[PDB]
Design a protein around this ligand. Structure first.
Ligand SMILES: CCCCCCCCCCCCCCCCCC(=O)OC[C@H](COP(=O)([O-])OCC(O)COP(=O)([O-])OC[C@@H](COC(=O)CCCCCCCCCCCCCCCCC)OC(=O)CCCCCCCCCCCCCCCCC)OC(=O)CCCCCCCCCCCCCCCCC
Ligand SMILES: CCCCCCCCCCCCCCCCCC(=O)OC[C@H](COP(=O)([O-])OCC[N+](C)(C)C)OC(=O)CCCCCCCCCCCCCCCCC
Ligand SMILES: CCCCCCCCCCCCCCCCCC(=O)OC[C@H](COP(=O)([O-])OCC[N+](C)(C)C)OC(=O)CCCCCCCCCCCCCCCCC
Ligand SMILES: CCCCCCCCCCCCCCCCCC(=O)OC[C@H](COP(=O)(O)OCCN)OC(=O)CCCCCCCCCCCCCCCCC
Ligand SMILES: CCCCCCCCCCCCCCCCCC(=O)OC[C@H](COP(=O)(O)OCCN)OC(=O)CCCCCCCCCCCCCCCCC
Ligand SMILES: CCCCCCCCCCCCCCCCCC(=O)OC[C@H](COP(=O)(O)OCCN)OC(=O)CCCCCCCCCCCCCCCCC
Ligand SMILES: CCCCCCCCCCCCCCCCCC(=O)OC[C@H](COP(=O)(O)OCCN)OC(=O)CCCCCCCCCCCCCCCCC
Ligand code: HEC
Ligand code: HEM
Ligand code: HEM
Ligand code: HEM
Ligand code: HEM
Ligand code: FES
Lengths: 380, 60, 164, 240, 77, 52, 380, 54
């Protein structure tokens, strides 16, 4: 007689990665967000699978097919609103995941952090293509805006965006290729998330204290199993109360109209995180400069592990950098609100002040804060 | 005198198969009982507005 | 232990109810939609069918042949015995109105439809595996395991017939 | 003027978190749409098969479908022909193409009123304010022909004359058809047409709220039960 | 499971040259065609006759189908 | 082949008959709860009422 | 300094799986077909991704979209024919794969063999649904036929067919859901191929002699790297000559017409890789009996490890079982031809004799031949 | 609607708007579209030549 849990190869892999995985005992609710992201990824895989089973990607029938899903298909309204509000919940959990890593110094896991940045890239691209999939007014116009941003690249952008468009504007070829890319990309997300978990598993998890947690480890089962189940239930509570009571609180009303190439909305307001990206674009008044500003505003997480100049890993025992980090979350919120707001005074000046503050905090102010903290603690 | 949870453990919860059996039986009965309760709360909080309330004015 | 396992049992009952409702909702989304249920009711077939001709329409999704049964064809079906086939079927029991007979082209071997006005029996010919059917819908020579089904129909005044 | 008037928050019967729509008001607003609003605005996504079981019964909705004519084809000779509509047919469009709509409505395109509540900010409050906010323009602005003042429409100039007034139609149940009553009924009907899953969604929301209010304390109880052995663990260091 | 240990081999000597020192097609035809003939001789009798009877019953089925479609003059009277 | 034909295996089997049979009843009641059979659920004194 | 190839985690996984994998030195060209199957899988992934990139899944626009791909899109005809002939070559490689597995005693790896069997089920389902995709006449009629063969099941078949149709017959809902399933299920095939290779790496690889290969084992690179590269190049020779010289000889002319539900085809048949199962189900003259004959005729592959009654693993030294195996291969060729042929004399009796002999050889004759073989070699 | 001279982007004009009109105006039989008929009939161009000359 032998133990199948360590003898059988699939079972020994599951045992070594999820069952007898040594984990720090003191990790808080902020560590449930990776499991929440995986659960939400699976939820979107199944939900969008059903949506694609009832959805056709063609310009004169995409909006009609979406309406047919909402009206004629049984529980299709529930399926589509689950998909949309789960994309919102996915980005909420993704931002809290990134914030956990930034606060607790998990970016020192360089390979895991870089794979996370790649996952963020793929998720944002997937969600943009999903947002343009229902072929609404704001969907089509946001697609044109983002593709013109891609066209801001010198000597390549015009041909590159006529290539991406499949023509000269957003049309049937663009919609069909975006449907294919949106359907297929979360499987690359899942494979790269398997790589993400493998790179994390190579070194173990991180405790909120930032210290060596090998002195006090607990198995992943049943402690973090039941904790993850509770986190899944809370996330399902928030998601499902959003779907069933406020299905348009995080949505957009202009998306509920058929797309018109002639008529344009007075405002281009994409989803929250794209509002952040749109504000960091609109900060500086040049095309290539704004494109590089957005690109660096996303790559700055990949640039983060080289900026750690402190002798302490987590921000639990670093109060000045706690203030700087919460000011960073503060102007994340400010830039999201400016992206929501139209282009007048004082939204402009608040925009570039928030942008300069955000970039200066991440580049300059945080390592200087760490140096000051070390020299107060007689570490520099 | 054994208590109520004592009798539940002695009769049903000790054996895992009987635990699953009473889970499934309770799933059936809780499913219907909660359906009746939630529906009754729904039409009491929305009495006089639903089609099942205004149905008799046009059915006959 | 009874109290703790009771808490666990009630939690498992709630999770099982939720999972059953979720899977049932997704399986209902898999199934037919409201427009497909609405199109299952047949409108008036009118009187555009010619004498001795068969018209093919969409009844219960499937192809349905409504054929004007000739007097000679009805006499041949009456002369053909009910006990001489693989299953007990008579012309009067199969067709309520002998002037027009409405059947569904769904064969009982691979679910094929028969070719209109073909075969060795004067009725229909399934060409997927070559089965002959008479005017009564009964199979005479072929690999069909059962006779051709007749959809349920209600006839109003002579210009109005409803199927499905 | 770029400034716009935010519509006020009317206390609808369906405004509550668990409160559904008044189906009698949905019915009344439906004949408001049929006798007033259907001559210009199209309805491409609401059908009589959606009408049944909500505001009309099956026989009433069937006869209401056959009271209007629907083009169907092809014919035996290969043409179109007009037949009485049925429950499977959608609502008849007033114009075949939007160009004909702009021709009949002097350059303005009446949008499809099947997602107008979910499409306009404010929703049914915006619809009620638009229909009840018609007034003479203030001294300072002159509007050319075919344009009417409305402070709730962005740009303040709308291509609609006031469609509704006192006794604009006759209700079948004897309710006095004042302008405010008609606007409220048609706004509730437009809310139903935009979101037909309203009552089922709120019933499912009540079920979800009760079930998760039952499950979250229990799941937290199992979490704290399994986590109890750690949270009461005591440590001691005994060096030699 | 890795190259560190798989089996216990003793007193076995293996010689090999460099691929840059020996040829790539050493007597490809002269010592290769008899090898193919040897392999064919070894496995010709337990392979071919199933395909031979495939060809036989395939031809029989084709000609019998053609004869069944061919009419039979049983109508002289 | 002849591994499971002996007195030890016979008494192990008849010890496991009540547990396996109870598990089969669990599977049956769970399957009819998931699929809502009319043929079973119309005979229980409660659940039949909501079908009407 | 460290050896990065064996110390980097993803790189040491790659090195232990494909670079420094101890492989048998004497494995013949039949061992290349697993790598050929993987490469054909990737080719199908990319090529069908471009097809769905330019494809619309709606009954009004499916055939017109296929014509648009073949004519208007730049070399989308080449993409479509690469996809179709790559599916055909995928089944060629699958048949030679299972032929190697049956002949060389590779079914003794029971977990690997069962994973391969369910992979075969998945590939067959994907290919059937992708043949439903172009919405040709024979495409739609084959969909109706195979789904009614599914409807042969008593008391479950009618409701389950109404469930899988999305309605009352094969219609827009059926076509769109088949599009979604056909897009998505090759990724489950890829994940199960990862599981397949994981089980194989756990159990090692087999040799044509059927012996312990541990005495003479060589690294996979560069030997089987260049051997598999040559196999891929010969595979591309066959695939590209089928694409560029004879694109329709493995195809179907009646698939080049729009699907007419009123007009039935004069002679219906599925594709060439479904022909043996179609012929045996024609041979048994019963609905439930026929569909059960099909399911058990693919499940006898899973039943194969329980039918090994010989003390020799591979058939390299078992001439009687080689004779029976080649009679079996001949019988599958007869079944393919009969499934191609219509229901007339004497194709019925040839099909019944072929199916009876096929089942008799695979279930009765081969173990008795193995026992006779052991007695002739005097093993007891 | 109106009439206009055909450009390059226009396809070949259908002689009948719907197949029912084609069947009614050509005595029941529906002439198939000759866009995939060589690829759709067994024999192909050989079948077309033999059908036209036979
Ligand atoms: C106030 C009155 C209660 C009180 O004093 O509570 C003190 C108590 C803290 O005192 P303690 O017992 O010393 O702390 C140990 C924890 O209780 C030990 O419990 P815990 O906090 O570690 O629990 C795990 C964590 C797990 O939570 C998660 O995993 C949440 C995941 C993120 C949220 C979902 C994602 C979307 C977010 C969108 C924004 O759950 C919570 O944080 C709250 C669970 C609530 C369950 C339902 C209660 C009804 O706080 C709570 O129990 C928090 C909930 C009640 C407030
Ligand atoms: C998510 C919340 C529930 C998590 C699962 C759980 O608590 O399982 C309890 C337990 C395991 O957790 P446990 O540690 O409480 O187990 C104690 C078990 N007894 C009481 C017998 C000592 O699960 C089971 O016993 C089986 C649950 C499934 C039952 C069979 C299926 C029923 C429906 C069929 C259709
Ligand atoms: C498990 C096998 C039995 C499933 C079954 O009969 O389910 C009936 C239930 C429904 O019960 P039912 O009593 O409505 O039966 C429907 C069957 N006819 C229409 C022929 C009377 O079906 C399902 O839930 C689908 C199961 C598919 C497997
Ligand atoms: C919300 C505020 C929650 C709160 O009170 O956080 C304080 C908490 C302090 O925790 P700590 O100091 O580590 O130690 C526990 C106390 N002894 O600190 C924490 O809980 C740390 C929380 C870290 C993650 C916060 C994420 C917020 C959202 C950030 C979005 C943008 C992230 C960057 C994107 C680029
Ligand atoms: C100096 C304060 C001393 C307070 C002493 C209180 C009593 C102490 C003894 C009793 C204990 C009471 C409880 C103690 C709680 C924990 C200790 C604490 O609160 O310490 C003070 C705290 C951290 O102190 P520390 O970081 O060392 O300060 C260095 C100066 N920067 O520092 C603070 O709380 C100060 C934080 C000020 C933050 C101001 C931020 C303003 C700008 C925000 C911009 C946000 C972005 C806006 C958009 C920008 C772009 C447009
Ligand atoms: C998952 C297994 C596959 C799907 C379920 C089986 C299936 O295909 O059922 C089809 C059937 C369709 O039924 P429907 O069209 O809704 O109309 C009722 C007429 N019988 O569907 C039904 O009758 C409903 C089946 C519901 C099954 C729910 C299972 C829940 C399991 C919970 C585990 C915890
Ligand atoms: C095929 C044509 C003949 C190929 C040939 O020459 O086969 C002979 C070859 C001999 O191989 P062997 O016995 O190992 O000889 C070693 C001695 N030096 O024998 C072999 O290579 C035997 C293995 C051939 C495998 C491919 C042929 C069969 C393909 C169809 C298998 C279908 C299985 C069932 C699928 C549906 C279920
Ligand atoms: C023909 C005279 C119409 C009648 C009857 C109704 N509507 Fe209308 N509608 C019509 C036009 C020509 C326009 C466009 C005018 C413009 O300036 O753009 C509209 C527009 C609307 C809108 C959209 C307003 C917006 O902000 O987008 C709404 C919400 C609207 N109309 C409401 C409405 C209702 C509820 C009606 C039935 C009582 C109705 N209109 C009738 C033309 C006509
Ligand atoms: C689809 C998106 C993602 C998924 C499914 C995912 C998955 C996971 C999971 C399951 C964990 C374990 C839970 C935990 O340790 O708290 C984890 C941890 C981690 N993730 Fe992610 N991740 C995603 C995106 C990201 C992103 C965007 C980043 C960073 C910018 C990132 C960086 C990290 C790091 C550094 C850890 C280690 C945390 C620790 O050691 O405590 N991941 N991830
Ligand atoms: C394999 C997984 C997925 C599939 C199959 C899928 C499929 C689809 C389909 C078909 C639509 C259009 C239907 C509709 O909008 O009504 C859609 C919309 C959308 N998708 Fe996805 N998707 C997947 C994953 C994701 C993920 C991971 C995200 C975000 C992180 C996302 C974000 C969106 C968004 C925001 C919409 C718009 C919803 C709306 O407009 O209401 N999708 N998806
Ligand atoms: C459908 C996609 C499949 C893929 C991508 C795949 C992949 C592979 C690969 C890469 C190998 C290694 C090549 C070798 O060792 O010679 C292999 C070997 C093997 N495959 Fe598959 N396979 C598939 C289907 C199947 C099927 C249908 C079966 C059997 C019914 C099967 C059973 C086996 C077995 C037994 C081996 C071991 C061969 C040996 O040990 O010599 N696989 N497969
Ligand atoms: C993610 C992977 C795949 C995708 C996206 C895909 C996509 C498609 C699409 C869009 C079509 C319809 C286009 C057309 O036929 O003109 C199609 C047809 C087809 N697919 Fe796939 N496919 C995939 C994998 C496979 C695999 C693995 C097989 C078989 C082993 C397969 C077999 C077929 C076949 C036989 C056709 C019919 C082609 C024709 O009749 O012209 N596909 N595929
Ligand atoms: S399907 Fe009709 S004879 Fe076979």
């Amino acid at each position: 007689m032998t133990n199948m849990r360590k003898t059988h190869p699939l079972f020994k892999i599951i045992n070594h990665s999820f069952i007898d995985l040594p984990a720090p005992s003191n990790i808080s609710s902020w560590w449930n967000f990776g499991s929440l992201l995986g659960v939400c990824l699976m939820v979107q895989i199944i939900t969008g699978l059903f949506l694609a089973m009832h959805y056709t990607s063609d310009t004169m029938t995409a909006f009609s097919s979406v309406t047919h899903i909402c009206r004629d298909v049984n529980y299709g309204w529930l399926i589509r609103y689950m998909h949309a509000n789960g994309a919102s919940m996915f980005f909420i959990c993704l931002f809290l995941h990134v914030g956990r890593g930034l606060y607790y110094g998990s970016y020192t896991f360089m390979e895991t952090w870089n794979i996370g940045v790649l996952l963020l890239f793929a998720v944002m691209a997937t969600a943009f293509m999903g947002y343009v999939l229902p072929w609404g007014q704001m969907s089509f116009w946001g697609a044109t805006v983002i593709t013109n941003l891609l066209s801001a690249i010198p000597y390549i952008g015009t041909t590159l965006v006529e290539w991406i468009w499949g023509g000269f504007s957003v049309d049937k070829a663009t919609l069909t290729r975006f449907f294919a890319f949106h359907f297929i990309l979360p499987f690359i997300i899942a494979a790269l998330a398997i790589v993400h978990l493998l790179f994390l598993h190579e070194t173990g998890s991180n405790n909120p204290t930032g210290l060596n947690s090998d002195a006090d480890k607990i198995p992943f089962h049943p402690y973090y199993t039941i904790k993850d189940i509770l986190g899944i239930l809370i996330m399902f509570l928030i998601l499902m109360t959003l779907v069933l009571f406020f299905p348009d609180m995080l949505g957009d009303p202009d998306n509920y109209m058929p797309a018109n190439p002639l008529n344009t909305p007075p405002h281009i307001k994409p989803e929250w995180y794209f509002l952040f990206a749109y504000a960091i674009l609109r900060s500086i008044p040049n095309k290539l400069g704004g494109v590089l500003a957005l690109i660096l505003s996303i790559l700055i997480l990949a640039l983060m592990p080289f900026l750690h100049t402190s002798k302490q890993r987590s921000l639990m025992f670093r109060p000045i950098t706690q203030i700087l980090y919460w000011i960073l979350v503060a102007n994340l919120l400010i830039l999201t609100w400016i992206g929501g707001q139209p282009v007048e005074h004082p939204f402009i000046i608040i925009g570039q002040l928030a942008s300069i503050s955000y970039f200066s905090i991440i580049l300059i102010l945080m390592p200087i804060s760490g140096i000051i903290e070390d020299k107060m603690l007689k570490l520099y | 005198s054994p208590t109520i949870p004592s009798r539940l453990y002695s009769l049903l919860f000790r054996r895992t198969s009987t635990f699953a059996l009473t889970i499934a039986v309770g799933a059936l009965f809780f499913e219907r009982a909660f359906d009746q309760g939630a529906d009754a709360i729904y039409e009491h909080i929305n009495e006089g507005k639903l089609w099942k309330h205004i149905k008799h004015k046009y059915e006959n | 232990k009874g109290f703790s396992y009771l808490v666990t049992a009630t939690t498992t009952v709630g999770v099982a109810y939720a999972a059953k409702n979720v899977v049932s909702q997704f399986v209902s989304s898999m199934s037919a939609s409201a427009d497909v249920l609405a199109m299952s009711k047949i409108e008036i077939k009118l009187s555009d069918i010619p004498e001795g001709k068969n018209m093919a329409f969409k009844w219960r999704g499937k192809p349905l042949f409504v054929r004007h049964r000739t007097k000679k064809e009805i006499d041949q079906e009456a002369a053909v015995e009910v006990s001489q086939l693989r299953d007990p079927q008579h012309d009067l029991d199969r067709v309520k109105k002998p002037e027009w007979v409405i059947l569904i082209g769904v064969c009982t071997h691979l679910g094929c439809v028969p070719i209109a006005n073909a075969g060795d029996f004067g009725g229909y010919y399934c060409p997927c595996h070559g089965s002959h059917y008479d005017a009564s819908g009964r199979i005479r020579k072929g690999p069909a395991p059962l006779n051709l089904e007749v959809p349920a129909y209600e006839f109003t005044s002579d210009d109005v017939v409803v199927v499905g | 003027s770029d400034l716009e008037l935010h519509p006020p928050s009317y206390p609808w019967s369906h405004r509550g978190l668990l409160s559904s729509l008044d189906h009698t008001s949905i019915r009344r607003g439906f004949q408001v749409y049929k006798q007033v609003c259907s001559s210009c605005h199209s309805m491409d996504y609401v059908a009589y098969r959606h009408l049944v079981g909500v505001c009309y019964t099956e026989e009433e909705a069937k006869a209401l479908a056959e009271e209007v004519e629907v083009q169907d084809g092809p014919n035996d000779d290969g043409e179109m022909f007009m037949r009485p509509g049925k429950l499977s047919d959608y609502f008849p469009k007033p114009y075949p193409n939007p160009e004909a709509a702009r021709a009949a409505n002097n350059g303005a395109l009446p949008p499809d009123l099947s997602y107008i509540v979910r499409a306009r900010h404010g929703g049914e409050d915006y619809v009620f304010s638009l229909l009840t906010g018609y007034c003479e323009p203030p001294t300072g602005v002159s509007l050319r022909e075919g344009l009417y003042f409305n402070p709730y429409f962005p740009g303040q100039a709308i291509g609609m004359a006031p469609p509704i007034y006192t006794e604009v139609l006759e209700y079948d149940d004897g309710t006095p058809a004042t302008m405010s009553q008609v606007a409220k009924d048609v706004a509730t009907f437009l809310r139903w047409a935009s979101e037909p899953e309203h009552d089922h969604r709120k019933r499912m929301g009540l079920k979800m709220l009760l079930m998760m209010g039952l499950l979250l304390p229990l799941t937290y109880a199992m979490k704290r039960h399994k986590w109890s052995v750690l949270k009461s663990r005591k440590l001691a260091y005994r060096p030699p | 499971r890795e190259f560190g240990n798989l089996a216990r081999i003793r007193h076995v000597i293996s010689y090999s040259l460099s691929p840059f020192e020996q040829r790539a097609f050493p007597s490809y035809f002269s010592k290769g065609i008899p090898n193919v003939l040897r392999r064919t001789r070894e496995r010709i009798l337990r392979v071919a006759p199933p395909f031979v009877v495939v060809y036989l019953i395939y031809t029989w089925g084709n000609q019998e189908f053609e004869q069944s479609k061919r009419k039979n003059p049983a109508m002289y009277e | 082949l002849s591994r499971f034909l002996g007195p030890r295996y016979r008494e192990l089997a008849r010890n496991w008959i009540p547990t396996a049979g109870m598990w089969g009843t669990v599977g049956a009641v769970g399957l009819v709860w998931a699929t809502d059979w009319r043929l079973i659920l119309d005979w229980v004194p409660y659940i039949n009422g909501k079908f009407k």
